[PDB]
C-alpha cells in the first residue's frame, strides 16, 4: 500500500467523479489559522460559542470562515455531517449534544473535531501503514460538509475490491445483530453487485480499494466513502490475510447453500473497538478512581 493510494481516498480526489451516487457535499479548504487551531497541543477551548470568588481562556475567532461555513451548511439544508480529508469524528460522538455528529454551525464541528482522535490522525499520521520509501506528500487540508441523513440502522455495508473484482461484502456494524439482514441477504448482495458494476468498477483511481455503501428504505444503494485497501481500513468480518491471500473467501458450502461462483463473499452477523472512543489514552469507574487516589498520594511523596 503506497502513499498514492491514501491520497486517492481524500474526499476531494474522488467526489467529483461520483457526485451522482453519493451524498451531496460541500468541500472547503482549511484556512492556515483554522488549521493551526485544530492542531493546538493545549487544552480544548471551543471557537465560535457557596461564594464563588483563575484564568479565563478564549479560543481564536474566525468570523469570515464561520460565515462561509454557515452559508455552506444552509446550502445543504441546515444540517450537515462533517469530516476532514479522510476521517469523520465518529469517536467523539459522546461529547456532542444528543451524542450526535449532526452539526448546524461551525462551533458544533469544532467541538467534535478537537475531541476526535480520528481527526488527529488525519493531521499527524495520514500515511501510517504505508509501505513506501518516498517522502510524505504535502496535504492540503479541507473541511467536508455532507448533507445530514437519518440513516436506518443496519443498512451500511463495506465492500472490498481487489484488481477491479468485488471479493467481499461485510456488514459495517458487525458487532450488532440485525434480523432483517439474513432475511434480505440475497436481495442485498445483488443490489450491491449491480451498483458496483454500473457505477463503481473501473471508475475509481485504483484497482484495489474499499468502498462503503448505504442501502436506503427503498432498496437504493448509495456510495458513502472510499478507503485504502490495506491495514488502515477496518476489515470488519474479514481479515486482511484472507482478502489479500488469493484464497476462496466464500468458505465450505454445498451445492444447496451455494450461489454463483463469481459472487463475492457476503458476511453479516449471526444470532448473538468502539468503547475506547469515550475513554482516555491512559484508560466500572470505581476501580479507576481508587487508582487515581493512589497515584495522587505517590506523586506527592516523590
Amino acid at each position: 500500500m503506497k502513499k498514492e493510494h491514501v491520497l486517492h481516498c481524500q474526499f476531494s480526489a474522488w467526489y467529483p467523479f461520483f457526485r451522482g451516487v453519493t451524498i451531496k457535499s460541500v468541500i472547503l479548504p482549511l484556512p492556515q489559522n483554522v488549521k493551526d487551531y485544530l492542531l493546538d497541543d493545549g487544552t480544548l477551548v471551543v471557537s465560535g460559542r457557596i461564594q464563588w470568588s483563575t484564568a479565563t481562556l478564549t479560543a481564536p475567532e474566525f468570523p469570515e470562515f464561520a460565515t462561509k461555513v454557515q452559508e455552506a451548511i444552509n446550502s445543504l439544508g441546515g444540517s450537515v455531517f462533517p469530516k476532514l480529508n479522510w476521517s469523520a469524528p465518529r469517536d467523539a460522538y459522546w461529547i456532542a449534544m444528543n451524542s450526535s455528529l449532526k452539526c448546524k454551525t461551525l462551533s458544533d464541528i469544532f467541538l467534535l473535531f478537537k475531541s476526535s482522535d480520528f481527526i488527529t490522525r488525519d493531521f499527524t499520521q495520514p500515511f501510517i501503514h504505508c509501505t513506501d520509501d518516498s517522502p510524505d506528500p504535502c496535504i492540503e487540508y479541507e473541511l467536508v460538509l455532507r448533507k445530514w441523513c437519518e440513516l436506518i440502522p443496519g443498512a451500511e455495508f463495506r465492500c472490498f475490491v481487489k484488481e477491479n473484482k468485488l471479493i467481499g461484502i461485510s456488514q459495517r456494524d458487525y458487532t450488532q445483530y440485525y434480523d432483517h439482514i439474513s432475511k434480505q441477504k440475497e436481495e442485498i448482495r445483488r443490489c450491491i453487485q449491480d451498483f458496483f458494476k454500473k457505477h463503481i468498477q473501473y471508475k475509481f483511481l485504483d484497482e484495489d480499494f474499499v468502498f462503503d455503501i448505504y442501502r436506503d428504505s427503498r432498496g437504493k444503494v448509495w456510495l458513502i466513502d472510499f478507503n485504502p485497501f490495506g491495514e488502515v481500513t477496518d476489515s470488519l468480518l474479514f481479515t486482511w490475510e484472507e482478502l489479500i491471500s488469493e484464497n476462496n473467501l466464500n468458505g465450505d458450502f454445498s451445492e444447496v447453500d451455494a450461489q454463483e461462483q463469481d459472487s463475492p463473499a457476503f458476511r453479516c452477523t449471526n444470532s448473538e473497538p468502539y468503547l475506547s472512543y469515550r475513554l482516555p489514552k491512559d484508560f466500572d469507574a470505581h476501580k479507576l478512581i481508587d487508582f487515581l487516589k493512589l497515584k495522587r498520594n505517590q506523586q506527592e511523596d516523590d
Binding site: T43, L44, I50, I95, S115, L279, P280, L288, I289, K293
Partner: protein
Amino acid sequence: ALPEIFTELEISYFLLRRLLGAAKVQKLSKNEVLMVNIGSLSTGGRVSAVKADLGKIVLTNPVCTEVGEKIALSRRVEKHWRLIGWGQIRRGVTI
C-alpha cells in the same frame, strides 16, 4: 441520591501533580472542556467556576446521574485525552 438528568455539576475535584506514565498538570482554567467519565458514560465539561477544591462544569451533553457519584477528569494534551484527576458531585442543575 435520586437519579436525575443533569446539565451542570458542582463538584469536589482533585488533580494529579503529573500525567501518568512527566508533564505537570495545569490548574483548572475557565472555558476549557474536559472529558468526564461518569460510570459507563462520558461527556464534556466546560469549566465555568473554580476554587481550590471546588469546581463547576457546564456539560456539553446532559447525563443521568446523582449527587455523590464520582467522576474521572481528562484534559486534551498534545491532541490526546489524558487523565488529570477525579471528582465527586456535590450539587447540580437539573432539567
